[PDB]
């Protein structure tokens, strides 16, 4: 705290409680006792624990009818109206597309949509496969996930 | 019909003005004006102006018949005090509270 380190009033003889600093934490303007530092909140996840969790959640995406596998899911030109009509055709409201090879037109046709997300088979994470209602995998994406996890 | 007059931020202590405001509560207003005329306090001068202003606000705004009016509700509240410094002996500083009042007179014929 910005301020001087001198004693405000001498140790014995005033009617006041004894103090030693204007920067004391029990004084106004000059507090925090256990002030925060910038810190890293990252936890360690074991490799086998991360993969066992992904296998468990993706098994529940299978068994709760939350997984769709198609041959190919793409778009001819990068416009979001085409993918809006396309996802309204397939009865998909809140959807996570996951594709084997990373696509550009599909990344631009769903960048504006918040209900829709588009990931690679490499870029899967545990909290998004639980967050979205349906998960539409490509068959190449199923092959790559089955390789990456086994 | 009630008719209110106030002196807000009157430069007198509330304790001093309550001693004069307790003279004229419940009285008729013609008698209360003479009570305040022949009372030798400064608060009588302060509260007589409020009473006369309540009479006039009754007469001009809605009112009736000055013979009818009574002083039914008179009260003094404490206002924002001023903080001053008073030097004393041996380098000690006292504070002076310069206490203000709010004087409220409600006049009503019924």
């Amino acid at each position: 705290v910005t301020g001087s380190g001198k004693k405000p009033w001498r140790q014995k003889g005033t009617g006041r409680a004894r103090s030693g600093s204007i920067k004391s934490p029990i004084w106004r303007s000059g507090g925090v006792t256990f002030a925060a530092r910038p810190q890293d909140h990252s936890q360690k996840v074991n490799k086998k624990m991360y993969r066992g969790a992904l296998k468990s959640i993706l098994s529940e995406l299978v068994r709760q009818d939350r997984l769709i596998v198609v041959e190919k899911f793409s778009v001819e030109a990068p416009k979001t109206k085409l993918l809006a009509q396309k996802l309204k055709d397939m009865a998909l409201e809140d959807v996570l597309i996951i594709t084997g090879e990373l696509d550009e037109n599909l990344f631009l046709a769903a960048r504006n949509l918040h209900k829709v997300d588009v990931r690679d088979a490499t870029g899967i994470d545990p909290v998004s496969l639980i967050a979205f209602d349906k998960v539409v995998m490509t068959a190449d994406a199923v092959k790559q996930v089955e390789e990456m996890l086994a | 019909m009630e008719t209110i007059a106030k002196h807000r931020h009157a430069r007198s202590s509330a304790q001093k003005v309550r001693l004069v405001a307790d003279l004229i509560r419940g009285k008729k207003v013609s008698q209360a004006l003479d009570i305040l005329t022949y009372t030798n306090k400064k608060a009588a001068v302060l509260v007589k102006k409020v009473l006369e202003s309540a009479i006039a606000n009754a007469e001009h705004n809605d009112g009736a018949d000055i013979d009818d009016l009574k002083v039914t509700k008179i009260f003094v509240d404490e206002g924002p005090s001023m903080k001053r410094i008073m030097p004393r002996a041996k380098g000690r500083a006292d504070r002076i509270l310069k206490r203000t009042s709010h004087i409220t007179v409600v006049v009503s014929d019924r």
Binding site: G13, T14 | K90
Partner: peptide, 22 residues
């Protein structure tokens, strides 16, 4: 402030004068 006032304390009252500035 600084006037002292006791025979010998750090700060008491006392009408004397060598002990006493609060």
């Amino acid at each position: 402030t600084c006037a002292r006032c006791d025979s010998x304390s750090r700060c008491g009252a006392x009408g004397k004068x060598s002990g006493x500035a609060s």
